[PDB]
Write a protein that binds this ligand. Structure first.
Ligand SMILES: [Zn+2]
Lengths: 40, 167, 125, 44, 48, 256, 49, 91
RNA sequence: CGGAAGGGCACCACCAGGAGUGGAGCCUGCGGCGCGCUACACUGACGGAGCCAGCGAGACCUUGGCCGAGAGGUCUUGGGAAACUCCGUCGUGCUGGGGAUAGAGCAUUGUAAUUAUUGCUCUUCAACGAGGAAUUCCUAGUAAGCGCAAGUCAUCAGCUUGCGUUGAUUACGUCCCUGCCCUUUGUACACACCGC
């Protein structure tokens, strides 16, 4: 039969591995959004 | 009359809301038939029709006779007469044709020279004539009125449009 | 018309409507006496303004009070506040402003919440 | 000035009226203090 | 154009069960959406 | 003051409609930026100017689990203050925090001690983001790992594509404190997939060669099921975005 | 359905067991008026409710 | 904008900024002429001070803070229709 | 890369308290861990008497009349919660606090009630005698307690969300510890201070 809505994803070691590698890339690059102070 | 007050008003509005005269049909008018046009015919001529008949060099009364397969009677009013008289010297030969004992002059009681208004008043008041023209906006006007025979000039001779008795 | 005033005592959810006029010395809590308040131990608490200021103008003056809303504590505090506000309104309007100032400063000396309301508005740190 | 007139509750008169040796009446100083005296030692 | 009466023929509708006749008049989409517009009108005027 | 706040709410709805028509005009004029060759209003007012202040609040009569959980929320959030809502009402609550002068509110809801709902309101008549949070993993639950560094953290947003996601990243960027240190040694992530944003605290260092992190703090999945223009104490203001559960494409459509 | 709320209904006599309800739970449902919804949670006190 | 000043400032803009239009706007009086009459009778007050001339443009704060003068018959019959008279404040 | 100084902050610190959990039973979320509910009686139990709110308005909810201890059912009619206050009874005994179990009986719903669907009546009267190791959390309408209403796209029904009532002890200081953070170029502008 059919379902009505998206399933809530359960989180696996491989998922958090891919995540933490993406984080490692973004922090090695040091590229991440920050709310920097408005100049002047 | 501030704009944000108007904004609040239209949002409130959406949230809340969520002697005459009728001219008779003529007695001579079956649904689009116009049974009142039988020989002899009674036709009404325009300046454009005159000048284009000169250009295509066709005869006026002989042309409408051969086009309409019977006898026909020509009419011009004082509006189109003064319109020819205003055109004047270059169409003096057109005035010479327009003055003729065989064409019967019809009088009018009008202020100005708008022969369009004159003739469209005539056809809105009579519905017994046949209009013979070449003009485009007036053609669309006599087209949007129903049950009336338009005959235009074009090609080698005249052409009838709305008359059911084409032959 | 009769010299009469109308005030309110307003606690947490308790509203008390008071109607005050010169009278014979009767106090009617919803048609019952002030000797017939409910919790039987806050009878002194509702008695407080009367014995604070004396009984004579209350002999002069008849008051009718009708109360809605609030628990018992809110109710009786709204009642005595309504009493003080109605009496100071009458003794301002129809009686002397000097005497009004006297009873006002005395009631402010003992307990201001009979006059003004206590709004426990919240605060964050 | 015009807007202060139209939006004022209290009276506001006209602002003002719009070579040769000329004297300045209002002094922004006590008029008898030396410039070196008004100068701070740090700033010199 | 090109269609049969056996194709456009008929699509009838069945009724409420004879055992659930205590709660009659089975609701269909048309009665549902009209109930919906009336309830939305009441909701909107309550909002006003 | 009722007249004042009503005038501010009217101007707020007018300004949001103006931002709306200007955004549609921006989509219209996007075609000419290629032919030849922005934060919100209430977050544009105080983007990097003022430090925010957030009040975290329980719904009502909470469990100890919710107590410690909102405590952990405060621990993750700079300039965050606890509130045990006991016999407090919604309107007087929002009005009292408006009286105090406040940036943002986060109030929590649950079922049987299990946190499952989080709503964030912007106090200067700002928008509200309504989330269902489920997959809660608490530091209290896991271990006595110590304490958070509580330095102004670094932010990592992932998979923010639509302008709805742009409004989201604006709101989260502005709820976190302005002007971080370049060497802020704790970093937060914003990991989006399948319309399920999920977050974990991360302290991090760079090695002799690469980088090394530690996941710490909380760990869960939330999902924005609503965004309203007005505040939460409205319950009637115009919804800016509504989730459609009962539709054809519901288990398939992304960003809705 | 034998008990209804705003956007909520309590439905009996569809399953024999709450185990059957849990085998078919979290699921897309619709009804004869055409309208959509979802079966979410079994009722514990009766079996197929 | 700058076109808002080069175009939109009107005699009608300053006229709705005028006081009795604001009274009729906040529905102090049902009609603007009755608002003018209330202005003449001084049954209103504009923040700290009451007023008597209709020829008044009101700053936005005083628009938020304008009302009737105290112990006025008009506000008293307001509280009489609402049946909420509080003679303690000589309302 | 390290050390040192100075300053600030913290119911993850100090300090004063409070309240639970963990002990018994029941419910419920996790694989033996967690969240709640009821008790352990005298500030208590029981019986009369009095009665004070608010949130909530998409064959249904009902004023009244009838009998039946009750549960209940019947005919008609339209589209005011508990805790609380007074009196009385009981009295320190796992006692009358506690109601777990079991039997018996009577009613309603349902084809059918049987494995009591459900309520009521009487009899049976267990554990629990204030909760170790510990645990948490907190500074005012706060904790807490009480009851009321709605389920209004996520999630919820021995459950969530609103609402009212009553209503406190102790701090409101400190970095002494536990940390954690900032500074160690006045840079800036008077006067003063300071001066690797
Ligand atoms: Zn004519």
């Amino acid at each position: 039969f059919d379902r009505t809505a998206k399933p809530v994803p359960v989180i696996t070691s491989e998922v958090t591995e891919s995540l933490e590698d993406m984080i490692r890339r973004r922090i090695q690059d040091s590229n991440f959004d920050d709310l920097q102070r408005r100049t002047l | 009359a501030k704009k944000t007050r108007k904004f609040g008003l239209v949002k409130r509005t959406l949230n809340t809301k969520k002697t005459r005269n009728i001219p008779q049909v003529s007695s001579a008018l079956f649904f689009q038939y116009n049974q009142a046009i039988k020989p002899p015919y009674q036709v009404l001529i325009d300046t454009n029709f005159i000048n284009f008949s000169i250009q295509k060099k066709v005869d006026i009364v002989r042309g409408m006779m051969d086009c309409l397969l019977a006898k026909c009677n020509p009419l011009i009013t004082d509006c189109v007469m003064a319109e020819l008289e205003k055109l004047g010297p270059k169409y003096r030969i057109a005035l010479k044709l327009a003055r003729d004992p065989r064409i019967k002059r019809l009088s009018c009681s009008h202020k100005g020279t708008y022969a369009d208004d004159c003739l469209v008043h005539r056809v809105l008041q009579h519905k017994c004539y046949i209009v013979a023209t070449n003009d485009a906006g007036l053609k669309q006007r006599i087209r949007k009125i129903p049950g009336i025979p338009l005959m235009s000039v074009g090609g080698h001779a005249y052409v009838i449009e709305k008359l059911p008795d084409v032959f | 018309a009769v010299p009469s005033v109308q005030t309110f005592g307003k606690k947490k959810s308790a509203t008390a409507v008071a109607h005050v006029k010169a009278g014979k010395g009767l106090i009617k809590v919803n048609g019952s006496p002030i000797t017939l308040v409910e919790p039987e131990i806050l009878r002194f608490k509702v008695y407080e303004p009367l014995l604070l200021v004396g009984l004579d103008k209350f002999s002069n003056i008849d008051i009718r009070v009708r109360v809605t809303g609030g628990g018992h504590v809110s109710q009786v505090y709204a009642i005595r506040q309504a009493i003080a506000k109605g009496l100071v309104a009458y003794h301002q309007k129809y009686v002397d402003e000097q005497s009004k100032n006297e009873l006002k400063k005395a009631f402010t000396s003992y307990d201001r919440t009979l006059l003004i309301a206590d709004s426990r508005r919240p605060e964050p740190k | 000035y015009k807007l202060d007139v139209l939006s004022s509750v209290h009276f506001v008169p006209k602002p003002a009226s719009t070579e040769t040796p000329t004297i300045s009446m209002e002094d922004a100083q006590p008029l008898y203090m030396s410039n070196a005296s008004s100068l701070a030692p740090q700033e010199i | 154009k090109l269609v049969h009466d056996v194709q456009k023929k008929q699509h009838r509708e069945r009724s409420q069960l004879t055992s659930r006749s205590r709660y009659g008049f089975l609701e269909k989409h048309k009665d549902y959406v009209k109930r919906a517009q009336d309830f939305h009108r009441k909701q909107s005027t309550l909002k006003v | 003051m009722l007249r004042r706040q009503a005038r501010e709410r009217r101007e707020y709805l007018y300004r949001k409609a103006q931002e709306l028509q200007d955004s549609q005009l921006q989509q219209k004029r996007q075609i000419i930026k290629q032919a030849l060759a922005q934060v919100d209003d209430e977050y544009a007012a105080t983007s990097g100017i003022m430090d925010p202040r957030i009040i975290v609040t329980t719904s009502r009569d909470p469990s100890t689990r919710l107590s410690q959980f909102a405590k952990e929320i405060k621990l993750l959030f700079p300039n965050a203050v606890r509130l045990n809502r006991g016999n407090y009402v919604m309107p007087n609550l929002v009005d009292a925090c408006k009286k105090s002068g406040t940036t943002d509110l986060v109030v929590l809801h649950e079922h049987r001690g299990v946190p499952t709902s989080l709503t964030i309101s912007h106090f200067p008549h700002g928008p509200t983001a309504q989330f269902s949070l489920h997959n809660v993993v608490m530091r209290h639950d896991i271990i006595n790992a110590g304490n958070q560094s509580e330095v102004n953290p670094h932010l990592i947003f992932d998979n923010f594509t639509t302008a709805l996601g742009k409004r989201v990243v604006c709101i989260l960027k502005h709820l976190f404190n302005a002007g971080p240190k370049k060497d802020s040694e704790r970093v937060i992530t914003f990991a989006n997939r399948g319309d399920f944003i999920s977050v974990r605290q991360h302290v991090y260092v760079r090695t002799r060669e690469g980088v090394e992190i530690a996941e710490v703090g909380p760990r869960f999945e939330m999902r924005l099921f609503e965004l309203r223009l007005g505040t939460l104490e409205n319950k009637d203001a115009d919804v800016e975005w509504q989730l459609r559960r009962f539709i054809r494409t519901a288990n398939k459509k992304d960003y809705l | 359905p034998y008990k209804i709320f705003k956007n909520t209904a309590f439905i009996k006599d569809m399953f024999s067991s709450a185990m059957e309800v849990a085998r078919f739970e979290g699921a897309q449902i619709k009804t004869v008026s055409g309208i959509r919804g979802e079966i979410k949670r079994a009722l514990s006190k009766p079996e197929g409710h | 904008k700058i076109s808002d000043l080069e175009n939109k400032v009107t005699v009608s803009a300053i006229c709705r900024r005028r006081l009795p239009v604001i009274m009729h706007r906040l529905k102090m009086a049902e009609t603007i002429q009755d608002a003018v009459k209330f202005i003449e009778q001084g049954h209103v007050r504009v923040g700290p001070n009451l007023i008597n001339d209709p020829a008044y443009l009101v700053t936005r704060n005083m628009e938020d803070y304008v009302t009737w003068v105290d112990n006025s018959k008009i506000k008293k019959t307001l509280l009489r229709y609402r049946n909420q008279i509080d003679d303690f404040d000589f309302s």
